[PDB]
Amino acid sequence: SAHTLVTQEQVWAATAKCAKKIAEDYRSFKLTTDNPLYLLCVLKGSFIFTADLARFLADEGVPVKVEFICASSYGTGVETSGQVRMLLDVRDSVENRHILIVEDIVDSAITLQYLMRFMLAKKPASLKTVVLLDKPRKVEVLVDYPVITIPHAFVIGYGMDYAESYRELRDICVL
Amino acid sequence: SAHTLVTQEQVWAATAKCAKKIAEDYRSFKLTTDNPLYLLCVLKGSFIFTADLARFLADEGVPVKVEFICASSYGTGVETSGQVRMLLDVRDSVENRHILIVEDIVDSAITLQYLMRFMLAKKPASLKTVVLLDKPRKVEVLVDYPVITIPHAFVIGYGMDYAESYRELRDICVL
Amino acid sequence: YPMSAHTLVTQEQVWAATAKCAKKIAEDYRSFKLTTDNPLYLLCVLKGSFIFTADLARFLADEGVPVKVEFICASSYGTGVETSGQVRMLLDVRDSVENRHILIVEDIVDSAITLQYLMRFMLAKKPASLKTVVLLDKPSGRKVEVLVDYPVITIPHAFVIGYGMDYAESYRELRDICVLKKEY
Amino acid sequence: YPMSAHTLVTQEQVWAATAKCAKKIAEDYRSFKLTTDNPLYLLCVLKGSFIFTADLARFLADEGVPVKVEFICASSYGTGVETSGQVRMLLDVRDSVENRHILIVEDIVDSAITLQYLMRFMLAKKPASLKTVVLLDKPSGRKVEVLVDYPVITIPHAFVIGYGMDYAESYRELRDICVLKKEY
Ligand SMILES: [Ba+2]
Ligand SMILES: [Ba+2]
Ligand SMILES: [Ba+2]
Ligand SMILES: [Ba+2]
Ligand SMILES: [Cl-]
Ligand SMILES: [Cl-]
Ligand SMILES: [Cl-]
Ligand SMILES: [Cl-]
Ligand SMILES: [Mg+2]
Ligand SMILES: [Mg+2]
Ligand SMILES: [Mg+2]
Ligand SMILES: [Mg+2]
């Protein structure tokens, strides 16, 4: 009851173009291993994207550190702020460091802005964002590196779930 | 090898004056149980203060909800931002709610400001602070309700530790 | 107190009970030669235990018992729990408790299985001893009672507020232990 | 790779090993009638296991095995750990794992006691089965080896970087498993 939307080779092809585009944008920063690009992986749905994107960034000679954050939605009392409860926070300080928030798909603009405000509180040198799936409004202003464009659809596979199932599929499918 | 600095009855006497002062300041807000004053208890050192202050706030007819946060210091890479790693975050949304950060003593201005930035990201109606022990500089601008003034000293008791020991003492002592 | 139908135990009654319990605890651990460097660890289960922890620690101070305090916080799962009572740890202890004496501090035992899980959790840290102290012992058969070691106030079954315990996150700040009026 | 003295296992070598391991896993759980609603849970120990988890899950997908993924993250304690290997849980699983089949996913077994603790931790959630998969099996006597169930690549003792594994939080992004040059 699922149809393929993007195959692994397509996702890889798109992620690899994204990696070169990232690599050329951060050239002017002279990144090093003591001052790398930090990949901020938002669990769970981003973990396979992060793993593949990291290695594509290695292909470009970009130095990478990998941080994970995990947050839980509130049942009530969130209207305009996208507040989520932080369960896992970064192991390393990110003061004056270059952060790339790695998302699979922007479910909630306002919740994305909240996470951005949370990281901005940590005084980073730069905050930018890379979203695997981009369905094209005026909250594209929040997304810097949209990897692949898709129509409005409930998707699974490639780390993304329906009810915790199907994260393990190589291709991205729709329901 | 410890001398008493403040006895329980003194701490209580001061906290009770603070509770009335708080109660009269938030009168203009018409607090209710659906819109209370949230006490943000910064673990561990504040837990006994919070427990006593809450009940003093009950004496004033202030409605109270109690949140806990726990954060760990970074070993390296923090210079100007007071970044700490959040281990426990609030169970309730605080959007448009009245928050009172409950500290025992301001060890680090910049780390206090970081926690303040973290809460401010959650869009509260008001953010204010109450610090049990206040040693009198220009970061008094960060402290709204200093309960008791003391000289520069390493203190223990009343929830406050030296090496996790002595939180359980009724009186505040110095070393 | 306007939201209280009955008052169940007053602040003064709770303290007196807790002072008695602290002396029972201090007698039971005299043989164990507790030091500052090998104290009794108070495991405050958040949130409900926190006022009770703050007072019980000070009654233990009266008894001359060296203490340290650790906090844990666990969230319940939406489904898939039947026999095990597992909960998602959101905050684990800051100090290792290997070969230490731990007292799990609880306000009420509302699920014996989850209490059992918390203990299995704690027993995996290989403590020297593990006991529990429950402020409100509510009606229970042998299954629960073998879990609780130090019941402070034996109490009939009711909806309690106050003394750290909540209704819809409200009323923890009350000085007395109250019964919530039906019209909440 | 400039920071690499030797190359230990290449990306292509690791995949081939992991595909073989995934088929061994899929044969071993055929009897258990794994469903979407009763799958094999992958317990990714952060951070080092994450690239390995992402690839191993997709090799399990090739084998037709239904998966779910949970992450845990634990910090080491400064002191007071000797026999128990306990670690402070910073992230516990999001789903209950009561009566489920769990595979702890590890990059290397660097402390048998801490691996034992993680298992005691997991065994308290009363899973239906608990097994471990380790990408790099390094030299070890019977003590460790009885803990590891599915070793992917048997390997000599060295300082590895790449494929998720780090030096000073650097080099996780490398496609190959490398040996760090002495002059780091
Ligand atoms: Ba996501
Ligand atoms: Ba403090
Ligand atoms: Ba409780
Ligand atoms: Ba590992
Ligand atoms: Cl198809
Ligand atoms: Cl596209
Ligand atoms: Cl004195
Ligand atoms: Cl004063
Ligand atoms: Mg989802
Ligand atoms: Mg301290
Ligand atoms: Mg409750
Ligand atoms: Mg490491």
Could you write out the three-class secondary structure of C67-122?
EEEEEEEEECCCCCCCCCCCCEEEECCCCCCCCCEEEEEEEECCCHHHHHHHHHHH
Q: Which residues contact B31 (CB under 8 A, 6 or more apart)?
A: B37, B62, B63, B98
Indicate if the alpha-carbon torsion angle A72, A73, A77, A80 is positive or negative: positive
Question: Contact at 8 Å (CB) between C49 and C106?
Answer: yes
* Whole-number Å distance between alpha carbons of A96 and D140: 42
* Whole-number Å distance between alpha carbons of B162 and B174: 10
- Which among B88, A110, A68, D118 has a CA at the least distance from the CA of C89? B88
Question: Contact at 8 Å (CB) between A158 and A9?
Answer: no
Among the partner-chain residues B41, B65, B165, the one whose CB lies closest to the CB of C36 is B165
* Whole-number Å distance between alpha carbons of C175 and C15: 11
Q: State how beta strands C4-9 and C88-91 pair.
A: unpaired
Q: What six digits make up the tokens of C142?
A: 């042998």
The SS3 assignment for B139 reads coil
Burial D139-173 (b: 16+ CB within 10 A, else e): eeeeebeebbbbbbbebeeeebbbbbbbbebbbbb
Question: Contact at 8 Å (CB) between A147 and A18?
Answer: yes
Question: Contact at 8 Å (CB) between C97 and C123?
Answer: no
Indicate if the alpha-carbon torsion angle D23, D24, D27, D31 is positive or negative: negative
* Whole-number Å distance between alpha carbons of D13 and D155: 12
Going from the C-alpha of A118 to that of each of A128, B85, B98, D64, the distances in angstroms are: 13, 12, 19, 40
Going from the C-alpha of D121 to that of each of C52, C102, C117, C120, D107, the distances in angstroms are: 28, 17, 10, 8, 19
Q: What six digits make up the tokens of A105?
A: 């798909």
Nearest CA in chain C to D114: C125
Among the partner-chain residues A86, A91, A117, the one whose CB lies closest to the CB of B89 is A86
CB atoms under 10 Å from CB of A8, counted, come to 15
Question: Contact at 8 Å (CB) between D67 and D39?
Answer: yes
Is residue C3 classed exposed, middle or buried when 0-12, 13-18 and 19+ CB atoms within 10 A define those classes?
Answer: middle
The SS3 assignment for A75 reads coil
Q: In what order do the strands lie in the sheet containing C177-180?
A: C4-9, C177-180, C160-161
* Whole-number Å distance between alpha carbons of C106 and C21: 14
CB atoms under 10 Å from CB of C103, counted, come to 23
Mutate to test the interface with D, among A168, A169, A171 (most CBs of D within 10 A): A168
Q: Which residues contact A107 (CB under 8 A, 6 or more apart)?
A: none
User: B150 C-alpha to center of ligand 8: Å?
Assistant: 7
Q: In what order do the strands lie in the sheet containing A98-105?
A: A84-88, A64-73, A37-42, A98-105, A126-134, A145-149
Token pair 């993250």: residue: D73
What domain range includes position B111?
A: 1-175
Among the partner-chain residues D47, D169, D175, the one whose CB lies closest to the CB of A55 is D175
A3 CA: distance to closest CA in chain B (Å): 38
Indicate if the alpha-carbon torsion angle B151, B15, B146, C93 is positive or negative: positive
Contacts A–D by Cβ distance under 8 A: 90
Is residue D182 classed exposed, middle or buried when 0-12, 13-18 and 19+ CB atoms within 10 A define those classes?
Answer: exposed
Those residues of chain A whose CB sits closer than 8 Å to some CB in chain D are: 33, 36, 41, 43-44, 47-48, 50-52, 54-55, 57-59, 62-66, 68, 70, 87-88, 91-92, 159, 164-165, 167-170
Q: Return the ∠ at Cα B11 (arms to B7 and B17), rounded to 5°.
A: 145
* Whole-number Å distance between alpha carbons of C172 and C174: 6
Q: What six digits make up the tokens of B108?
A: 């680090």
> Closest ligand to D94 CA?
9
Question: Contact at 8 Å (CB) between A70 and A87?
Answer: yes
Question: Contact at 8 Å (CB) between D56 and D18?
Answer: yes
Q: State how beta strands B84-88 and B64-73 pair.
A: antiparallel
> Closest ligand to B48 CA?
2
* Whole-number Å distance between alpha carbons of C136 and C130: 19
**Amino acid letter at C148?**
V
Going from the C-alpha of C16 to that of each of B55, C21, C59, C63, C173, the distances in angstroms are: 18, 9, 10, 13, 19
Q: Return the ∠ at Cα A156 (arms to C79 and A14), rounded to 5°.
A: 145
Those residues of chain C whose CB sits closer than 8 Å to some CB in chain D are: 77, 79-84, 86, 88-90, 92-100, 117, 120-121, 124-126
**Binding-site sequence positions of B:** 161
Among the partner-chain residues C36, C58, C173, the one whose CB lies closest to the CB of B55 is C173
Which structural technique was applied?
Answer: X-ray
Burial C19-33 (b: 16+ CB within 10 A, else e): bebbeebbeebeeee
Residue B58, H or E segment: helix B47-59
CB atoms under 10 Å from CB of C46, counted, come to 22
**Looking at chain B, which subunits does it touch, using at least 3 CB pairs closer than 8 Å as the criterion?**
A, C
The SS3 assignment for D149 reads coil
- Which among A67, A48, A58 has a CA at the least distance from the CA of A8? A48
* Whole-number Å distance between alpha carbons of C37 and C151: 27
User: A75 C-alpha to center of ligand 2: Å?
Assistant: 29
CB within 8 Å: A168 and D69: yes
Distance linking the first and last C-alpha atoms of chain D:
12
Q: State how beta strands C4-9 and B172-174 pair.
A: unpaired
> Closest ligand to B169 CA?
7
Q: What six digits make up the tokens of B99?
A: 């928050």
**Number of domains composing chain B:** 1
A160 CA: distance to closest CA in chain D (Å): 11
Residues of C identified as active-site: 110
User: C56 C-alpha to center of ligand 2: Å?
Assistant: 21
